[PDB]
Amino acid sequence: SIEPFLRTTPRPLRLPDGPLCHQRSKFLLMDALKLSIEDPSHEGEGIPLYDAIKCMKTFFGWKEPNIVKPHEKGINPNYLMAWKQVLAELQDIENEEKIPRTKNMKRTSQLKWALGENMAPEKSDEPEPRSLASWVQNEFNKACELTDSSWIELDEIEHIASMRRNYFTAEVSHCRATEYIMKGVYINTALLNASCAAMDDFQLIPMISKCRTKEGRRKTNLYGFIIKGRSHLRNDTDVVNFVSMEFSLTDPRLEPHKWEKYCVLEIGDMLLRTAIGQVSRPMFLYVRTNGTSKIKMKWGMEMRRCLLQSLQQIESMIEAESSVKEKDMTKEFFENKSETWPIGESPRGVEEGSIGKVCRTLLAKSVFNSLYASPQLEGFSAESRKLLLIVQALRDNLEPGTFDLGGLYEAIEECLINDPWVLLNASWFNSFLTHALK
């Protein structure tokens, strides 16, 4: 071997300095708030706008809306007028005997500003470097956590595979990341179908999900509304602009950097339980202009793929330790809950976790790869894998070739600009690296 002082120790990835990064998801994640109704037995899927109105009637604290956090780069009265127009159009729907399957809105000056002007019938890019904000890790943690509700539905009614899918499903059915899959499937289905069927119209689209309570009873959830803009989507890259209007209890003043793209309205008073007792807290509406494409909407409609792809990664882990002990450990892993995995960290060091925590962490990572999909992620993922293989080989005292390590770091650090998800993944790599070559 070469003298120890000549051996190359991989340095940390360098993250760029700059203003804290902002939320760029297509919908709210940890900050969402659901207005919900309990579905009739044998219901099925209702008329979305009928479910939307029923969900809104379960809230008793509606009040005159006001701007409480301006969008710095927006015309804030247009956001306030847009919300008042959604309420006026829902009232017009309520006043008709028959609730329609879709609703075309009046193309007012406020919506034209937010979405764009009429056009004749046919014959991410943000460049500045941003620093990693604490909210990204916090979002990821919330995605890994369990909800009171089940998000995966049973089907119509080989020992290993069946037992594995069932063990995995039991661990992730209540997982917040599973809520994000079903929320994403529903809204991308509604937006793509509307984009194809009503190319010129501004359609009012409820943001809906369904789940089952602890009591096995069916719930319909309303997160808010999207207004679709003009949608002549010829190629799969063509952008449809939309306005998102999303319920929340989050005070936007806590993390102003997170909410740079949004106008926040105060729309209601919510009665909340606290240790001391009952308190009135504001219900907010998070409003922004955003955009998506046929290909992104198709990916969103496919988000149940995250469940198969994360099950695959768990299967491989049970396969490796089933070889060594020459006895398939499936039952023992999910049953014993005695075997642990390094899955978390604190200032105190690495935190070991149950197989359940591993199932939910890998699902959350797959789902965040989909919600925050980007070219920078594809580059970071390919190049970072090459570095991880060198670190594993060094950790095992194998002396891998380091002569081109310089060119590998350049290719990875090229991907670290301003994407909140890629910057978190880079930070995660750094933490692993400090523990790997201790």
Binding site: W341, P342, I343, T361, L362, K365, W428, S431, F432, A436
Partner: peptide, 10 residues
């Protein structure tokens, strides 16, 4: 804090 890259330590 959950960090899936830590799985590579085991």
């Amino acid at each position: 804090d959950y960090n899936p890259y830590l799985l590579y330590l085991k």
